[PDB]
Short mmCIF file of C-alpha atoms in Angstrom, two decimals:
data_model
loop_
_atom_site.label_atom_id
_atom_site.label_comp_id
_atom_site.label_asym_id
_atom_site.label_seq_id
_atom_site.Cartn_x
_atom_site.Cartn_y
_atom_site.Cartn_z
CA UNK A 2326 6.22 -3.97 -34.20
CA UNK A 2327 6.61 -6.00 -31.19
CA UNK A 2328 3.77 -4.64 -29.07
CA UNK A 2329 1.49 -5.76 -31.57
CA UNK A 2330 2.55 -9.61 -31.93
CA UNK A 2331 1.88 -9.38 -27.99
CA UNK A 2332 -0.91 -7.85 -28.35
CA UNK A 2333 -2.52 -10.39 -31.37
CA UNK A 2334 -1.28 -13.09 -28.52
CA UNK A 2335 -3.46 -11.53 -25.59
CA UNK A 2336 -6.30 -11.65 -27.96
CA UNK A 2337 -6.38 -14.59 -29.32
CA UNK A 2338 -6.24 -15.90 -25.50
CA UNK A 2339 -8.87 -13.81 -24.34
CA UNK A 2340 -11.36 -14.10 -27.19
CA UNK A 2341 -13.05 -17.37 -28.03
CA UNK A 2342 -15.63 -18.05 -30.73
CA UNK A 2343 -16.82 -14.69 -30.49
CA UNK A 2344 -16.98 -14.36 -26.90
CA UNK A 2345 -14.63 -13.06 -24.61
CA UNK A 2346 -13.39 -15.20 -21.43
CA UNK A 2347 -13.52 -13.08 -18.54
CA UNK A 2348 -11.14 -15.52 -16.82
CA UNK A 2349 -7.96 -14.75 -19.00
CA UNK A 2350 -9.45 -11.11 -19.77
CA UNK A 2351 -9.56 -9.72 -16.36
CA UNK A 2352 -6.09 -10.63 -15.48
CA UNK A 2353 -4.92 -9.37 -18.86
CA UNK A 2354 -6.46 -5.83 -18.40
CA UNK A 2355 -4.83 -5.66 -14.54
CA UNK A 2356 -1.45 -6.75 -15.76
CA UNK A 2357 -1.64 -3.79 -18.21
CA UNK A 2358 -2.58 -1.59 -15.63
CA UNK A 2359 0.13 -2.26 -13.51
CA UNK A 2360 2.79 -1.87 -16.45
CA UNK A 2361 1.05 0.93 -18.03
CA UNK A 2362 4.12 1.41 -20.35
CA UNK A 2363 2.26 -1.16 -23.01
CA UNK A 2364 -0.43 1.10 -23.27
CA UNK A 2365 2.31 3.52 -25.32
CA UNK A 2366 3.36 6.57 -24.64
CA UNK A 2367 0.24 8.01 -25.31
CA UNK A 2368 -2.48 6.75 -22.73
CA UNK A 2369 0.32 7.43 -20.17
CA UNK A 2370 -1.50 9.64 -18.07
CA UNK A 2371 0.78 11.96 -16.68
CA UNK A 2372 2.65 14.12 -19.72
CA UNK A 2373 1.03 11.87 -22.43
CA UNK A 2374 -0.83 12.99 -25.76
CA UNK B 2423 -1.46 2.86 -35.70
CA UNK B 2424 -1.35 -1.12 -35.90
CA UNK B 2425 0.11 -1.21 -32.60
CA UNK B 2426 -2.94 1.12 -31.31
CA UNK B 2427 -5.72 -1.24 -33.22
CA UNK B 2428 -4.44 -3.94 -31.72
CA UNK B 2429 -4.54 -2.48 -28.44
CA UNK B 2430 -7.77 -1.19 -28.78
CA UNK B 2431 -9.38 -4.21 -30.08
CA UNK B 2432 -7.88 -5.98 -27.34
CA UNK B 2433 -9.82 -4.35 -25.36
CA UNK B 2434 -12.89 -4.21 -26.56
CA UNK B 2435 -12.32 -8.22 -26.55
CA UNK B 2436 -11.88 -7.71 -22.90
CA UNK B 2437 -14.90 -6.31 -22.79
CA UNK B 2438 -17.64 -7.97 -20.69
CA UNK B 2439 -20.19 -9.35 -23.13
CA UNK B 2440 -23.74 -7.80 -22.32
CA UNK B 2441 -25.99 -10.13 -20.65
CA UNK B 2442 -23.57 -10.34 -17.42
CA UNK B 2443 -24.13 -5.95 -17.70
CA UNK B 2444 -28.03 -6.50 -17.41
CA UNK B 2445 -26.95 -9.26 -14.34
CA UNK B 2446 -25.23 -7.07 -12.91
CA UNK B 2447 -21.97 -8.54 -12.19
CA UNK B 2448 -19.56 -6.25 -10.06
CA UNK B 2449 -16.50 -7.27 -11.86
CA UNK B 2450 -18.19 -6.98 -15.48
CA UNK B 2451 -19.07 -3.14 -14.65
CA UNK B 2452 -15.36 -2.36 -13.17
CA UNK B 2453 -13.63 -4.04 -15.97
CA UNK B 2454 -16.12 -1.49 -18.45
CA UNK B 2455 -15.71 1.48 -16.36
CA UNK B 2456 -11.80 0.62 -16.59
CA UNK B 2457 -11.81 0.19 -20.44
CA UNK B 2458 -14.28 3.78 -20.89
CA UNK B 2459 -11.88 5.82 -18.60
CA UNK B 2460 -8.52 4.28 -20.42
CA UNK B 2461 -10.33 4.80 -23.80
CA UNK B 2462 -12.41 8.16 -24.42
CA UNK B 2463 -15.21 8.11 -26.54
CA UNK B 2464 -14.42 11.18 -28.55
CA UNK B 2465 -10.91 10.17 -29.68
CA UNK B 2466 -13.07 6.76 -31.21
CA UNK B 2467 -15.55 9.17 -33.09
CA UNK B 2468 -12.48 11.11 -33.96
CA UNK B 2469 -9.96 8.48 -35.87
CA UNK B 2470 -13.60 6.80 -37.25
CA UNK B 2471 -13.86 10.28 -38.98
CA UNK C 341 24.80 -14.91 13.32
CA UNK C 342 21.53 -14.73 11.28
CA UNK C 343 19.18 -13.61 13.76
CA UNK C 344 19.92 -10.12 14.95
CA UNK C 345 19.02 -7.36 13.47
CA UNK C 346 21.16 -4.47 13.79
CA UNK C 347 21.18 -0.85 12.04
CA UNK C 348 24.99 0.81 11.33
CA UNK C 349 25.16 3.96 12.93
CA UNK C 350 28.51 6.56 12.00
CA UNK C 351 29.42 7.38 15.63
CA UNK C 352 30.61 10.81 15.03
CA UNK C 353 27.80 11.78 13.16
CA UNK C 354 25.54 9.60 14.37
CA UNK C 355 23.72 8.79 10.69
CA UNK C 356 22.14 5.75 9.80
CA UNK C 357 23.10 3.45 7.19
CA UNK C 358 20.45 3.32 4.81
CA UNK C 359 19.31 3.36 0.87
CA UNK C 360 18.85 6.51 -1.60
CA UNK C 361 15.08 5.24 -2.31
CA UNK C 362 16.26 4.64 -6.23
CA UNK C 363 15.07 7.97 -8.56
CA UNK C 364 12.64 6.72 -10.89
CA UNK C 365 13.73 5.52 -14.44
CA UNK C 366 15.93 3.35 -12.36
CA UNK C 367 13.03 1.04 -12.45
CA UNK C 368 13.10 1.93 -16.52
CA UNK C 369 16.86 0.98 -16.34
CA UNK C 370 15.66 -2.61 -14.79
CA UNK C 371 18.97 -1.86 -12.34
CA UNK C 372 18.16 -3.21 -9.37
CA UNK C 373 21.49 -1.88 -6.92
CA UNK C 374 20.44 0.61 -4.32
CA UNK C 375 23.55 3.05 -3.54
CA UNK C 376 24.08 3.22 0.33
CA UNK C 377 23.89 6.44 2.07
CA UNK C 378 24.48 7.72 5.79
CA UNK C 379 21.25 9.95 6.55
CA UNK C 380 19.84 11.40 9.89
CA UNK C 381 16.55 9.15 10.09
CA UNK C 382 17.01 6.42 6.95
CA UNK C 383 14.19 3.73 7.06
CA UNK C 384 12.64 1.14 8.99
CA UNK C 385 14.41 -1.73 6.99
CA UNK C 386 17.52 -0.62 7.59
CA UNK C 387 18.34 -3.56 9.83
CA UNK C 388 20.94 -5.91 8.76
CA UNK D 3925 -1.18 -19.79 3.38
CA UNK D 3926 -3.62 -22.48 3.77
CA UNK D 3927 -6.27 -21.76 6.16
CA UNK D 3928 -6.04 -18.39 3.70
CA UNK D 3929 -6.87 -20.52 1.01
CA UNK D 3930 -9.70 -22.22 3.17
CA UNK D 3931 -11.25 -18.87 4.13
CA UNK D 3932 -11.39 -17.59 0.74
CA UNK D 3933 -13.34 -20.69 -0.58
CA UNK D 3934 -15.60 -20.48 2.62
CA UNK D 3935 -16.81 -17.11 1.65
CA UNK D 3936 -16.76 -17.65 -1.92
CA UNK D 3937 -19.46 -21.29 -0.65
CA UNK D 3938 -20.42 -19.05 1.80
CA UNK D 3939 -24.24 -17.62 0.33
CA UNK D 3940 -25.04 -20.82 -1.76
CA UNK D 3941 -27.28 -22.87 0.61
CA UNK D 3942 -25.53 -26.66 -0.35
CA UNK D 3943 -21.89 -26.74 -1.81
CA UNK D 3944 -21.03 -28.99 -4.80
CA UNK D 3945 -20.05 -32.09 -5.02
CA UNK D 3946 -16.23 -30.65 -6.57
CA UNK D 3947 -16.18 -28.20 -3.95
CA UNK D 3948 -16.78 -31.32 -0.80
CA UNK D 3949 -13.50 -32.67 -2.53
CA UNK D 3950 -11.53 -29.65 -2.44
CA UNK D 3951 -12.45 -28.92 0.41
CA UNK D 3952 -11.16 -32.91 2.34
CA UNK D 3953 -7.77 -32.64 0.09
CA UNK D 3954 -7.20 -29.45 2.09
CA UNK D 3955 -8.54 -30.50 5.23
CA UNK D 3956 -6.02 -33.62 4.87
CA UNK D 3957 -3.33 -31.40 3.74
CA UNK D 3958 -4.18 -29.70 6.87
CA UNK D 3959 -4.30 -32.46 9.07
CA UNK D 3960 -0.99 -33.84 8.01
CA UNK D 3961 0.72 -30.50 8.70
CA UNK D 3962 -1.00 -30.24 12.25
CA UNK D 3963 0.10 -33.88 13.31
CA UNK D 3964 4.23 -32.60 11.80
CA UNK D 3965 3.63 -29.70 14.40
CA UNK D 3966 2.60 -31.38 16.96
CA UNK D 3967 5.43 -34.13 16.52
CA UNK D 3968 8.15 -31.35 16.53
CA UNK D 3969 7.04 -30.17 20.03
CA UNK D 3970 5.81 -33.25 21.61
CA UNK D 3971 8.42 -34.83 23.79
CA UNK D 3972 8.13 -31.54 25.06
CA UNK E 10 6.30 -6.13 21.52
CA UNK E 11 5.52 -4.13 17.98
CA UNK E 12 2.33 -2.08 17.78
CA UNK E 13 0.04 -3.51 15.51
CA UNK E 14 -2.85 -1.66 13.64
CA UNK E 15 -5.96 -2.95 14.07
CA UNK E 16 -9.69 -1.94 13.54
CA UNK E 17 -11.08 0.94 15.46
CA UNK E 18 -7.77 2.91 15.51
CA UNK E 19 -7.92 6.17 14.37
CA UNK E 20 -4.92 7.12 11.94
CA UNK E 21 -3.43 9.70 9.80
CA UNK E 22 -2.47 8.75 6.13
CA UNK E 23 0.95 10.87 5.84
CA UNK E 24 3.30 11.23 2.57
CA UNK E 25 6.55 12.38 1.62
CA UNK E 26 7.84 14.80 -0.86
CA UNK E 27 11.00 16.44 -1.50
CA UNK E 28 10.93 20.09 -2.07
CA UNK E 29 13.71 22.13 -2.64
CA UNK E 30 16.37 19.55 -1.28
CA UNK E 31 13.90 20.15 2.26
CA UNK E 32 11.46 16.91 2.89
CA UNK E 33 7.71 17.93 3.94
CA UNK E 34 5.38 15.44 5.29
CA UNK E 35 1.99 15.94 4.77
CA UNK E 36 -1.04 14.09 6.06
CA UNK E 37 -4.59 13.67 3.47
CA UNK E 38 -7.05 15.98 4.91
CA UNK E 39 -10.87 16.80 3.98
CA UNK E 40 -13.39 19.15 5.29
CA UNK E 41 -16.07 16.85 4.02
CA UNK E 42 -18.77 19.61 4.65
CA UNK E 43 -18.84 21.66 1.74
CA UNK E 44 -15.72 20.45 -0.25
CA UNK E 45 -15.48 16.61 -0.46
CA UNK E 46 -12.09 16.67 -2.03
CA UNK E 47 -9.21 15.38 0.00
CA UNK E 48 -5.87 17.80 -0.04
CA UNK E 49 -2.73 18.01 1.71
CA UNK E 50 -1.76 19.41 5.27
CA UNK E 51 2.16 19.70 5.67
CA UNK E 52 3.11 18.48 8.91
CA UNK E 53 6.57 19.70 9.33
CA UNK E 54 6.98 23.33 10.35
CA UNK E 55 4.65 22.35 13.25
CA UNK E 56 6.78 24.02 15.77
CA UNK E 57 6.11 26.79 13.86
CA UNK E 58 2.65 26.78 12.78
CA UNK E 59 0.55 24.41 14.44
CA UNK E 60 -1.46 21.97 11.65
CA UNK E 61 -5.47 21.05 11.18
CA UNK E 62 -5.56 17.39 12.24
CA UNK E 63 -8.55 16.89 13.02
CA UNK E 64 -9.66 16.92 9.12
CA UNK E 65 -7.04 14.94 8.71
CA UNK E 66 -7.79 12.15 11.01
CA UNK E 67 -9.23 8.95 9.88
CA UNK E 68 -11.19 5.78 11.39
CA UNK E 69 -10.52 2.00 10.89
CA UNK E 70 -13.89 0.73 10.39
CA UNK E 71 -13.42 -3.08 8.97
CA UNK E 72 -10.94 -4.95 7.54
CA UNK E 73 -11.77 -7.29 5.27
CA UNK E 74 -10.34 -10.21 2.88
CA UNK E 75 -11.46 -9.75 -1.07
CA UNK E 76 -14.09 -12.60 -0.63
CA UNK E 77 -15.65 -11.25 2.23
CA UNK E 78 -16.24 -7.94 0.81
CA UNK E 79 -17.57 -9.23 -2.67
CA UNK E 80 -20.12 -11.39 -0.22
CA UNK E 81 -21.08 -8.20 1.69
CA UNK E 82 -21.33 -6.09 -1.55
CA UNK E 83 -23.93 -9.09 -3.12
CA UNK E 84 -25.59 -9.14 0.25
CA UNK E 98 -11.12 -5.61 17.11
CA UNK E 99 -9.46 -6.68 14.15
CA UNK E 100 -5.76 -6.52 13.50
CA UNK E 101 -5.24 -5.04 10.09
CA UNK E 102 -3.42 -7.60 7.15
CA UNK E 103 -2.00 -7.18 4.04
CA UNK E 104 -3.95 -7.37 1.22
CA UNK E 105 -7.45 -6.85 2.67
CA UNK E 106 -9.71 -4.44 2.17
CA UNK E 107 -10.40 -1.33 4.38
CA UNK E 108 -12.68 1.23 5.31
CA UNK E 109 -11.87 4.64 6.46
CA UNK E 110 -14.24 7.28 8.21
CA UNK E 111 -13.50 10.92 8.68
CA UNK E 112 -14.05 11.13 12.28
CA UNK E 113 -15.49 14.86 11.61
CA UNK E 114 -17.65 14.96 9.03
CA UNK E 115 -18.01 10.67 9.38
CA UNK E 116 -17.62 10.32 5.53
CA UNK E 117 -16.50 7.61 4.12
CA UNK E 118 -12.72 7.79 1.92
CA UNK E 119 -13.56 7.03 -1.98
CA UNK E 120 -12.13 7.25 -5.59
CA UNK E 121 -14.60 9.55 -7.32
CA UNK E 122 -15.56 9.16 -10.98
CA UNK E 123 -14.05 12.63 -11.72
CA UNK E 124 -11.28 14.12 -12.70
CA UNK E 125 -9.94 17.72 -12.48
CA UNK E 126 -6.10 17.20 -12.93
CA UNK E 127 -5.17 18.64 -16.31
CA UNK E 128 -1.93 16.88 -16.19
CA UNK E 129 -3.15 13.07 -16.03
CA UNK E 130 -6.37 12.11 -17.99
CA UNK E 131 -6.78 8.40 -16.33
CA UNK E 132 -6.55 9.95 -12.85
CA UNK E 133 -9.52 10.18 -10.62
CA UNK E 134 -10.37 12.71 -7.80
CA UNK E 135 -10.08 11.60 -3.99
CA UNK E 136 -12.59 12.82 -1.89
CA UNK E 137 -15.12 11.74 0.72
CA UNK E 138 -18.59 10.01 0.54
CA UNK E 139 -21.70 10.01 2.25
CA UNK E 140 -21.97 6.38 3.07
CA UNK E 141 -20.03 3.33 2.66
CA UNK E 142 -22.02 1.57 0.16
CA UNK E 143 -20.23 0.25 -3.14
CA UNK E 144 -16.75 -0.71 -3.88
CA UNK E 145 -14.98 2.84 -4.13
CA UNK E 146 -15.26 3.48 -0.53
CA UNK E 147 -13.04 0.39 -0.37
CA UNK E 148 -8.52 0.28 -0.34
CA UNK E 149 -6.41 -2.50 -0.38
CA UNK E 150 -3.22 -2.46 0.98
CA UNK E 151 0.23 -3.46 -0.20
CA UNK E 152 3.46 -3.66 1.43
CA UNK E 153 5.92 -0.99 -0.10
CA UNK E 154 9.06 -3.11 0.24
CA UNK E 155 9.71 -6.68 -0.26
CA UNK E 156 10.73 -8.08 3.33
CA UNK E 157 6.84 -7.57 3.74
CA UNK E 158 4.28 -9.43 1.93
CA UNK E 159 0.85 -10.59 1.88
CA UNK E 160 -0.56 -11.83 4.29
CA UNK E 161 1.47 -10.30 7.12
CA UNK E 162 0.29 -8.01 10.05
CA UNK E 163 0.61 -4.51 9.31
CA UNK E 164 2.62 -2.77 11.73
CA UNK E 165 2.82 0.70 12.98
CA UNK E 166 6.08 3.06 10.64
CA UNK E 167 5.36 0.92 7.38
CA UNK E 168 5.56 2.35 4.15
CA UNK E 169 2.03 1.07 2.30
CA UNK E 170 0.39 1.23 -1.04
CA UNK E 171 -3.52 1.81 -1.12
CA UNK E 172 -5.46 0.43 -4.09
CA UNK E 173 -9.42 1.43 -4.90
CA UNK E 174 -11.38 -1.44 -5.68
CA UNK E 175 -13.63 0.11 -8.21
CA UNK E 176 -10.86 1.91 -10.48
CA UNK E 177 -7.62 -0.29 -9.12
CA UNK E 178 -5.68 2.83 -9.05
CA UNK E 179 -3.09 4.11 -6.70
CA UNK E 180 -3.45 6.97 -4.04
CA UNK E 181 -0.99 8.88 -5.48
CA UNK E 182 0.68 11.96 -4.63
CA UNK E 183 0.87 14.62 -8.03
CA UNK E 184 3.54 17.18 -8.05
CA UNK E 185 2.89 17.77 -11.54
CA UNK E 186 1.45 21.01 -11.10
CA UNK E 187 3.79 22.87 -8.72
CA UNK E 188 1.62 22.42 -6.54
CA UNK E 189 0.40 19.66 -4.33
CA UNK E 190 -2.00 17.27 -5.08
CA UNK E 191 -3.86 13.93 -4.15
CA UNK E 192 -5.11 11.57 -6.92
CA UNK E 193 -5.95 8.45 -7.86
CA UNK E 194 -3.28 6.76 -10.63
CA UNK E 195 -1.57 4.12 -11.94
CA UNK E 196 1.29 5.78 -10.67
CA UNK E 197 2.06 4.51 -6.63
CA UNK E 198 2.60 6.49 -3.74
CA UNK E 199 4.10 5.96 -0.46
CA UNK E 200 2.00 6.16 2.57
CA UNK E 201 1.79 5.91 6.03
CA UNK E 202 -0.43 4.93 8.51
CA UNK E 203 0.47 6.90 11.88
CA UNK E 204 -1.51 6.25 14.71
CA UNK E 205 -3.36 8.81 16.93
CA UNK E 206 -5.92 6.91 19.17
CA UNK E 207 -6.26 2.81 19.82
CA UNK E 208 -8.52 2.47 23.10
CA UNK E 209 -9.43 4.79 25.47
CA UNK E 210 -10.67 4.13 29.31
CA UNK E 211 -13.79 5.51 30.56
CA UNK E 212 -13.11 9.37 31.10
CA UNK E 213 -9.24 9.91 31.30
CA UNK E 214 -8.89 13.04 29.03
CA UNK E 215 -7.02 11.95 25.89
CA UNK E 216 -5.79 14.32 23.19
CA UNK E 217 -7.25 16.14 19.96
CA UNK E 218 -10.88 16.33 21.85
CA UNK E 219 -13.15 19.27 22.23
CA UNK E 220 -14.38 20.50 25.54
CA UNK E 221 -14.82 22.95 28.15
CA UNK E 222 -12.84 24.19 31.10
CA UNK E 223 -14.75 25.30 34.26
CA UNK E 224 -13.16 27.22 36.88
CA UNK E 225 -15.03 25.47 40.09
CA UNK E 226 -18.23 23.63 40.45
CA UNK E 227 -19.48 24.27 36.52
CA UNK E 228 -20.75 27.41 37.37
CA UNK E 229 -18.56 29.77 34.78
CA UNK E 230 -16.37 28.47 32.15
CA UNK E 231 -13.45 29.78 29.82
CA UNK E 232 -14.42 31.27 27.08
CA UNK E 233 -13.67 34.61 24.20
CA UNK E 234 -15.92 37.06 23.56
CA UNK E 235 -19.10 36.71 21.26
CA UNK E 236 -19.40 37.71 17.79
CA UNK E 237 -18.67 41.41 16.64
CA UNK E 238 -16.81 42.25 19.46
CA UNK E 239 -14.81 44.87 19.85
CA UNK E 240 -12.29 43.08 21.45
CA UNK E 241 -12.35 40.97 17.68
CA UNK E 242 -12.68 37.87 20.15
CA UNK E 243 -9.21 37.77 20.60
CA UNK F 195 71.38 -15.11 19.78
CA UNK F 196 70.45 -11.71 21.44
CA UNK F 197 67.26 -11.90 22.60
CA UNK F 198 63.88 -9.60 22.00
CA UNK F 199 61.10 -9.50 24.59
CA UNK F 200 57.49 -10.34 22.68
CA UNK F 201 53.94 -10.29 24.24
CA UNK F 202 51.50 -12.78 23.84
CA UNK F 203 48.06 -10.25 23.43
CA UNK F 204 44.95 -12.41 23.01
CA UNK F 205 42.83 -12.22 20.31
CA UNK F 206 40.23 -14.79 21.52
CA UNK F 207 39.49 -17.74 23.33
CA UNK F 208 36.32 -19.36 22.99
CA UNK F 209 33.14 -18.30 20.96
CA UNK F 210 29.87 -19.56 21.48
CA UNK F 211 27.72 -20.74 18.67
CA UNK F 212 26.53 -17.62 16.44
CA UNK F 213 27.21 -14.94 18.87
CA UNK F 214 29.43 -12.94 16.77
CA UNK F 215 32.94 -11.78 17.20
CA UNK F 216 34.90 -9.38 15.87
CA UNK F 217 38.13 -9.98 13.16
CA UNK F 218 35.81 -12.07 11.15
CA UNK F 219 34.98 -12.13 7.67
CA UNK F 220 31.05 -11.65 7.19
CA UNK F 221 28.37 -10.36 4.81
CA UNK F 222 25.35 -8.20 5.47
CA UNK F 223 21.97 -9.07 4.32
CA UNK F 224 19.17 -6.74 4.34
CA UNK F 225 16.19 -8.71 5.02
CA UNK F 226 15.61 -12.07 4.37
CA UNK F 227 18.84 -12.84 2.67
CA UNK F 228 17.60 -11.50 -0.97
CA UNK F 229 20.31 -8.40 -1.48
CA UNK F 230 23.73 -8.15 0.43
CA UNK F 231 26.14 -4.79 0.87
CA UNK F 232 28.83 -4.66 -1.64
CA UNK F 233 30.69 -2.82 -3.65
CA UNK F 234 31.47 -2.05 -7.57
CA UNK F 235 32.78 -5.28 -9.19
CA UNK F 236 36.16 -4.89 -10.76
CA UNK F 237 36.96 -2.22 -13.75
CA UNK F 238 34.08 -0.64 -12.76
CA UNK F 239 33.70 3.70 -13.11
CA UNK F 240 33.01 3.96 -9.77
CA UNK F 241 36.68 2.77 -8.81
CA UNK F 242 34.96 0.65 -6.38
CA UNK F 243 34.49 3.62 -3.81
#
């Protein structure tokens, strides 16, 4: 429920009048990378459906 | 499955738009590559269906 | 005071006072205390 | 952390034949920033 | 003084894992001829069983800041955190890389670790990060300390995968402790060093040591 | 009014600046001064051992 009012956040930041700003985007996708616990805990990788 | 939509079309805002692809731009085709290995194409096809 | 850096070493046994390199999930936990242990080799940042 | 800063906007001027006007300014408030701090180094050790 | 890494240096990348309550070290290792893919060589029962290091032995070629290496991809040296290196295998001079496949059945983001012809492109490419927070960026790397390598391309982790039961070297988001232990810095003008191939001669060159040819009796041993 | 023999036994004298001495009251700092080495705080499981 949570993850997903983050997640509606990120993209209104990243997405502007149908265009994405690589800027804010970039930096989102490498933050998610390194905590790759908001991906879920599917997409985990290791163990993960 | 909200919080998975969200996350997925978060990322596909993320996405580099096009015309830097046909430039060329070395951080446009690492941020795609990143998205296509997080996201498989057949689990797309799959929850379309 | 300040300046030195020294390592504790158990004379007996001659171990090194050093940290138990947290299990993971401790990172999960968000605890951020490392319990001290005497080993044969520790690490390089053992100085104090 | 500043002469990092400096090298990192040299390269990133570094192919384009003329830099821009915003990046001549950047480039004296960090050269002045830079001055300042050299003349505060040298006035701690002059005397000697 | 404090040794100091720097470019040119030829290195081992060595990790730790605990197996049954025992630590192993093991250094990355790659044929490069035949099998790109790196693997693990344990380093620890050495006394008893002497190890292949020369596979496992690795070049500093350059060192470089982000910037600098975006320039030279759209176009000594003492080593720093966070810049960007390049590493040769000194036998089959390959070039260290985060492949675009994956074998491991246990992570689906990971990537395979192998070797690459030349050192065009971005995967060829590592960054490093200090392990602990006494270092940071910026800061000379010094000889002992715990790193973290980063590919440019994928901005994964070389990462060590005991998920199997065995061993295994991958790229993932998942970190993994490594170190970079010297073997060679600079070497003067003959003065035999280590881990080098060559001959003995008894006198003046004219016989050498040697076993016997190829199906032998003796079985050339 | 009978009388004991006592011994003066030094302790110290005269410290330089820093230059540690022992019977003093000191913390321990791993690195640059971010985490020191204590023990439990009070009603703690551990007993504080």
């Amino acid at each position: 429920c949570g993850g997903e009012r983050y997640l509606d956040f990120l993209r209104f930041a990243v997405f502007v009048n149908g265009e994405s700003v690589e800027e804010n985007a970039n930096v989102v996708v490498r933050l998610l990378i390194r905590k790759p616990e908001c991906f879920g805990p599917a997409l985990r990788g290791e163990g993960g459906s | 499955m909200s919080f998975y939509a969200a996350l997925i079309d978060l990322l596909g805002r993320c996405a580099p738009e096009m015309h830097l692809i046909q430039a060329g731009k070395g951080e446009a085709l690492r941020i795609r590559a990143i998205l296509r290995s997080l996201v498989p194409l057949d689990d797309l096809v799959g929850i379309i269906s | 005071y300040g300046e030195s850096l020294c390592f504790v070493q158990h004379v007996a046994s001659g171990l090194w006072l050093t940290y138990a390199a947290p299990d993971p999930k401790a990172l999960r936990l968000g605890v951020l205390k490392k319990k001290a242990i005497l080993h044969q080799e520790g690490h390089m940042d053992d100085a104090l | 952390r500043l002469q990092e800063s400096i090298s990192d906007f040299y390269w990133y001027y570094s192919g384009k034949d003329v830099i821009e006007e915003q990046g001549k300014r950047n480039f004296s408030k960090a050269m002045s920033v830079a001055k300042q701090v050299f003349n505060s180094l040298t006035e701690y050790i002059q005397g000697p | 003084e404090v040794q100091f890494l720097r470019t040119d240096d030829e290195v081992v990348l060595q990790c730790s894992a605990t197996v049954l309550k025992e630590q192993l070290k093991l250094c990355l290792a790659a044929e490069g001829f035949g099998n790109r893919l790196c693997f693990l060589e344990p380093t620890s029962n050495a006394q008893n069983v002497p190890p292949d290091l020369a596979i496992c032995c690795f070049t500093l070629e350059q060192s470089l800041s982000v910037r600098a290496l975006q320039e030279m991809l759209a176009n000594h040296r003492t080593l720093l955190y966070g810049h960007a290196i390049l590493l040769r295998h000194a036998h089959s001079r390959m070039y260290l890389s985060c492949l675009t496949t994956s074998r491991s059945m246990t992570d689906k983001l990971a990537f395979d670790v192998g070797l690459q012809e030349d050192a065009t492109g971005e995967a060829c490419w590592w960054t490093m990060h200090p392990a602990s927070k006494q270092r940071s960026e910026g800061e000379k790397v010094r000889v002992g300390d715990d790193l973290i390598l980063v590919s440019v391309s994928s901005e994964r982790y070389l990462h060590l995968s005991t998920a199997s039961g065995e061993l295994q070297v991958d790229a993932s988001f998942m970190q993994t402790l490594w170190n970079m232990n010297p073997i060679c810095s600079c070497c003067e003008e003959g003065y035999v060093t280590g881990g080098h191939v060559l001959r003995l001669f008894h006198g003046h060159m004219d016989e050498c040591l040697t076993i016997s040819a190829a199906d032998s009796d003796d079985q050339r041993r």
